[PDB]
Ligand binder design. Structure first.
Ligand SMILES: CCC/C=C\C=C\CCCCCCCCCO
Ligand SMILES: [Mg+2]
Length: 141
């Protein structure tokens, strides 16, 4: 659900700043990872794709070929409250996007294209949070 995705996003986003330099991702492109979900944030920059690799690697969410590791992704998602309701759908949805971009061999570019597809399909399927839901989780600390 969108509520569960808010919790996943809020945690996943904590590795933005440590990944910023190696990805070449300007603050001007993305200042806080929660804005990934803004209606009018365009998910396009190769640097954001590099950042997403870097952030995923932190939680072993990538397989040897820089695609989603399905098992580790499922385990990550179920580590959040009610995570089991989202885990099957989210893997299926991401993997479907990956197949559409399998002919992009540049890893950063492939991953940003996959991220954009995942955002769009997440809205269609009802698992996209609003920024305010993401902020509400972050704000409990
Ligand atoms: C991914 C869990 C954190 C929540 C939102 C972040 C979304 C951006 C990226 C979606 C996953 C992309 C990994 C697939 C790479 C295929 O080569
Ligand atoms: Mg490769």
């Amino acid at each position: 659900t969108a509520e569960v995705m808010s919790h996943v996003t809020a945690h996943f986003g904590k590795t933005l700043e440590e990944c910023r330099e190696e990805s070449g991702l300007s603050v001007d492109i993305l200042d806080e990872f929660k804005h990934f979900w803004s209606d009018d944030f365009d998910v396009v920059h190769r640097e954001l794709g590099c950042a997403i690799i870097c952030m995923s690697n932190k939680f072993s969410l990538m397989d040897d070929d820089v695609r989603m590791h399905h098992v580790n992704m499922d385990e990550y998602i179920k580590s959040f409250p009610n995570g089991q309701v989202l885990a099957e759908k989210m893997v299926k949805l991401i993997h479907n996007c990956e197949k559409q971009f399998d002919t992009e061999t540049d890893d950063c570019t492939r991953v940003v294209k996959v991220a954009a597809c995942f955002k769009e399909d997440s809205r269609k399927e009802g698992i996209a949070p609003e920024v305010a839901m993401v902020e509400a989780v972050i704000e409990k600390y």
